[PDB]
Amino acid sequence: RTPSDKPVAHVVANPQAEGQLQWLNRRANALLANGVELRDNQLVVPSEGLYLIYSQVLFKGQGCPSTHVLLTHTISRIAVSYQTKVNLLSAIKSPCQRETKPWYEPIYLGGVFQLEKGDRLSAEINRPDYLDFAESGQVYFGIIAL
Amino acid sequence: SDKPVAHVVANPQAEGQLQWLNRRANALLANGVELRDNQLVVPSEGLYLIYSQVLFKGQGCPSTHVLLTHTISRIAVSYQTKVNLLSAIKSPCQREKPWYEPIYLGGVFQLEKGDRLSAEINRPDYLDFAESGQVYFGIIAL
Amino acid sequence: SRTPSDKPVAHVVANPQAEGQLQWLNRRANALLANGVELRDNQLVVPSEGLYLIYSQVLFKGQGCPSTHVLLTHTISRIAVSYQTKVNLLSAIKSPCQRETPEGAEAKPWYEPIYLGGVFQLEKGDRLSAEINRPDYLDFAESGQVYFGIIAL
Ligand SMILES: C[C@@H](Nc1c(Cl)cnc2ccc(-c3cnc(C(C)(C)O)nc3)cc12)c1ccccc1F
């Protein structure tokens, strides 16, 4: 019947953005609906409430170097009333333990959070050079109002 | 309540395949969602949260490099056109003791009436068939 | 304003002040309890029967390897009103150190995140715990690294 009025977003990484994790909505199977905006690479919350927040990144390397590789993926919240950047969800992986075959490290982050109107959300990594885009659906960021 | 929903689980008896079931312990199909040809069929257009999880298990590492994939695809109504919505890859063996590798996926998508969704893996021989609350596939109309 | 969700939900985080322990908090920025979920004696209390996604992440960190004898575990358990003893729902074990650090070599910091997640039929009054064996290896300095939650489907 009547379509959903729930604020939602599902944005995907730009495979040809050099040295960055750039989010896009103008792609097949990506979206912004019911007031969610994508501004300065951040998802902007249109109304207060409970939201599921999620992101996936996929890292890939060919063997292990001598300099220690640390991979991080973090979802942050910038609340309009506080004007502060706070981690909501974060993970750190060390793909190489003993040093030198291609390795793969997916990092999926998800949770339920109380958000405020105007909050800004970012999903970031430290190593965009290790991102893999072999297939579609491997690198994404989204929110769903409950 | 009237929202199309599904939560299907893997068959622990289906040899070398990832077979989804709605006739099991904590599974369901409601408000028009169907399970046909191992694919969830969308009864109406709208926003859906689509999710899944698979578990892989191996005893040690072989000489051949093992890559584990899990993918959720969308097959647009009428056409056979298959497109990845969500996908991940894991390499359990680095240097070639039992290991465990979960892969979980989830996101919100605009779907059309009659779209078919599949949740597939490349290695059903590595599937951890144990009837835990952990190999599943589901959708929820928002 | 839109009608609030009536779904029981929780997202609790580790107390970063409680070093050497895994203490869950709802009384912390960006942590919540809603629609009847309680946090009592470090456990999540289920307010109503149904399907729930239960999830948790812990992050372990060490500087080098003391030997290959470090075992890291994370477990989610259920205490049902009908069977008031812990049953494991989800569990994982990790050995961060494979070869042990040779004397004087760079003690490269290792990281081991463990995610536990699944969908379970729960009953009213179920108590859920998310526990680790090594709180001394837990890295909860920065926010968002260590959490435990439930979402009624
Ligand atoms: C985004 C999410 N995705 C999932 C994944 Cl990657 C895996 N399994 C799931 C199982 C069930 C559901 C789910 C979540 N929410 C519902 C509602 C209340 C909208 O009806 N219905 C099913 C979502 C997920 C996620 C992941 C991790 C931590 C919290 C989450 F919300």
Taking CB atoms and an 8 Å cutoff, what residues of chain B touch A136? 83-85, 87
Residue C102: helix, strand or coil by DSSP?
Answer: coil
N-term to C-term CA, chain B: 11
The two structure tokens encoding residue A103:
């390795």
- C7 within ligand 1 shell (Cβ under 6 A): yes
Contact between B67 and A104 (Cβ < 8 Å): yes
Q: How many domains does chain A have?
A: 1
Quote the tokens at residue B22. Answer: 């709605």
The CA distance from C130 to C147, in Å, is 9
Euclidean distance between CA atoms C144 and C134, whole angstroms: 19
Neighbours of B87 (CB within 10 A): 23
Interchain proximity A28–B85, CB inside 8 Å: no
Q: How far is CA C55 from the centre of its chain?
A: 7
Task: Measure A110 CA to ligand 1 centroid, in angstroms.
Answer: 8
DSSP string, B37-54: TTEEEP-S-EEEEEEEEE
How far is residue C141's CA from residue A92's CA, in Å, rounded to a whole number? 13
Within chain C, strands assigned E span: 9-14, 24-25, 32-34, 38-40, 43-45, 50-63, 72-80, 83-94, 109-122, 127-132, 147-152
- In angstroms, the CA C56 to CA C118 distance is 10
CA of B51 to the centre of ligand 1 (A): 7
Greatest CA separation found in chain C? 63
Tokens of C65: 């390897």
Alpha-carbon gap, residue B98 to B58, rounded angstroms: 6
Q: How distant, in Å, are the alpha carbons of C44, C92, C93, C140 from that of C133? A: 19, 11, 10, 15
Tell me the residue range of the domain where A66 lies. 1-146
What would the two tokens of residue A78 be? 């910038």
CA-wise closest residue to B109 among B137, B81, B79, B74: B74
Q: Does ligand 1 lie within 6 Å of residue C87's CB atom?
A: no
Among chain B residues, CA nearest to A57:
B88
> What distance in Å separates the CA atoms of residue A63 and residue B106, rounded to the nearest whole number?
29
Q: How far is CA B5 from the centre of its chain?
A: 15
Is the torsion defined by CA of A137, A89, C147, C9 positive or negative? negative
User: Residue B34 carries which side chain, given as an amino acid letter?
Assistant: E
DSSP secondary structure string, B10-37?
A: E-TTSTTS--EESSSTT-EEETT-EEET
Structure tokens at A109: 């982050």
Nearest residue (CA) to ligand 1, atom 4: B106
Q: How far apart are CA A107 and CA A102, in angstroms?
A: 17
Burial letters B97-109, b for 16+ CB under 10 A, else e:
eeeebbbbbbbbb
Resolution in A: 2.1
Q: Quote helix, strand, coil % in chain B, to nearest 5.
A: 0, 55, 45
Say whether A90 and C30 touch across the interface (CB within 8 A): no
* Number of Cβ pairs < 8 A linking chain A and chain B: 83
Q: Closest by alpha carbon to B65, among B92, B102, B42, B88?
A: B92
Q: Which residues of A touch B (CB under 8 A)?
A: 3-4, 6, 8-10, 28-29, 31, 33, 52, 54, 56, 58, 60, 97-98, 101-104, 106, 108, 110, 132, 134-138, 140, 142, 144
Pairwise CA distance, residues A53 & C11, whole Å: 12
Chains that touch B (3 or more CB pairs under 8 A): A, C
Residue B45, CA atoms < 13 Å, CB-side half-sphere:
5
Cβ neighbours of residue A50 closer than 8 Å, sequence gap 6 or more: A112, A113, A114, A115, A145, A146, C4, C5, C9, C32, C34
Helix (H) or strand (E) holding A87: strand A84-93
Where does chain C break, by residue before each gap (C–N > 2.5 Å)? none
Report the distance separating Cα B136 and Cα B122, nearest Å: 16
Buried b (16+ CB within 10 A) or exposed e, C44-69: bbbbeebbbbbbbbbbbbbeebeeee
Q: Per the structure block, which two tokens stand in for C13?
A: 């985080």
C27: amino acid identity, one letter: R
Residue to substitute in A51, A52, A140, A143 for testing ligand 1 pocket (most ligand atoms within 8 angstroms of CB): A52
φ/ψ of residue B74, rounded to 5: -120, 130
Q: How many CB atoms lie within 10 A of CB C7?
A: 18
Nearest by Cα to B60 from B100, B88, B17, B16: B100
Method by which this entry was solved:
X-ray
Write out chain B residues lying below 8 Å of A140, CB-based: 86, 107
Separation CA B121–CA A132 (nearest Å): 18
C55: its two tokens? 């999830």
Instruction: Tell me how far apart the 2 most distant CA atoms of chain A are, in Å.
Output: 59
Closest CA to C149 of C23, C52, C79: C52
Residues of A with CB under 8 A from a CB of C: 5-6, 47-50, 52, 68, 70, 74-75, 77, 86-94, 97-98, 107-108, 110-114, 145-146
DSSP for residue A6: -
